[model samples]
Target chain A: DIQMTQSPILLSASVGDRVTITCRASQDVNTAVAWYQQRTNGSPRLLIYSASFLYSGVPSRFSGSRSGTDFTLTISSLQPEDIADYYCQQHYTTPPTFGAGTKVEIKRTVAAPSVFIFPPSDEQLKSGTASVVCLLNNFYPREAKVQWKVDNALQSGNSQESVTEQDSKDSTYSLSSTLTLSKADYEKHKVYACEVTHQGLSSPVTKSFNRGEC
Target chain B: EVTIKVNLIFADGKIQTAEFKGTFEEATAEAYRYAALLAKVNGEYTADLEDGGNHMNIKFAG
Candidate 1:
């Protein structure tokens, strides 16, 4: 293990702080490096490698540049798209090691709560409907849970959904979830929640969206 | 220590990028890293980082 460490365990860069990561080669392994992002699923997406290089299909604002033993992941303008847990990996050896991620966040909002939601979005809300179709979009970490909350009450259903990840700047994977409910129960004004828990964070975070015909 | 300078520019002339000053244990390692990253960003060098002599330099498009 090359033993990698990231400083400022938590960085609060205001838009453009020219964030940098120092990745030392332990012993000059003379091997290339690859950087990845860990999204909701706890997996990473390859971003930088060999110290300085961007992965394919990555955005321009996100760039990798290096000087000596220090390599930096620069977000030129720090767009919302650039916000996330950014980490570095050295392909010089395996199991490759990663730097503790620097959470790039937008100006903090009121901070959402930690709870799962169900029956979110207009397409799935049908008054008293038992069979409901779910849709997931712009969802990260391909691994998330969807639960049903009917009239502020908990509802349970068989969860049968496949998982997938969105392309990431970091080498991690983000996921989404979908749930089906009967049409007869859709009009019940149920509350559906999406819960995602993964490594790299202290606790699980959940987001609730609106279901049609609330 | 081998030393070199790298000038980086955006194809769109967004702003004049700065020149990177690099000092690697070896010259070739310095060059190889720069070329590997640049070409990868462009449309070249689709392979792993190469093993070059031990010296390198980065001269960008003016």
Candidate 2:
């Protein structure tokens, strides 16, 4: 299967700590492992391609090295902005494999977020257009990503998110995103979903809206 | 070991494929991994593990 296993799934290191992550492939993928960093509200950017080559624009603190099927991604000095999930993928074979992913986050004032999906409102539905809203409430670190999907497919309607707002009382964060789609698509699609990913959680939090329900 | 094919349809209308030998479960999981590697943040893509004879077909949004 060439399964990929990563170590230190959750790392707690302050800025300037030499953060280290490791990946091991069940089968030898040589130096074909690539490391990626997925920050809050962003795509997974390739930090290192080919086991040891640092991607352009990537700081020298981030580096990769491989020995046999084991590849190591290291951060010379972790920065506050370096807080993100790291993943390794082996591309040597036709069917690629991925690591478990490591999240390098230091202490934070906030925690996980609660997600909610709002279907088309009456006014929008009446106009032959639908605006689905995804909301994240009381989350940590003042950042989140909200995306919409159709049926079960991870299809984003339109990529736009509202700025994160902090609660004056609790100091947590809240954010929302509105997806624009045709009312026709809403009725045609089986289920509309709101998917939210936060660094505090291991996986994404999802809420689904069906035409059959409110 | 059985053979599984991972078919990817890209934005430019080009179709690429990769084959690997493993159990159905392993191969199928690998196929999804390949699809995820090419996943775009804003683009929607569809994946199906159809035809156990050979599984995994991904059509990315253009």
Model 2, global lDDT: 0.73
In candidate 1, position A85 carries an lDDT of 74
* Two-chain DockQ for each candidate model: 0.03, 0.02
Backbone clash total for model 1 is 62
Q: After superposition, how far is residue B46 of candidate 1 from its true place, in Å?
A: 43
| Candidate 1 per-residue C-alpha lDDT over A139-160 given as tens digits, one digit per residue, 9 for 90 to 100 | 3333445554445565565455
By TM-score, how accurate is candidate 2? 0.42
The TM-score of the first chain in every model comes to 0.46, 0.53
**Candidate 1, CAPRI quality class derived from DockQ:** incorrect
The most accurate candidate by TM-score is 2
- Regions more than 4 Å wrong, model 2: A108-214, B1-62
iRMSD values, candidates in order: 9.8, 14.8
Candidate 1, B36: how far from true, in Å? 27
Query: What is model 2's native contact fraction?
Result: 0.00
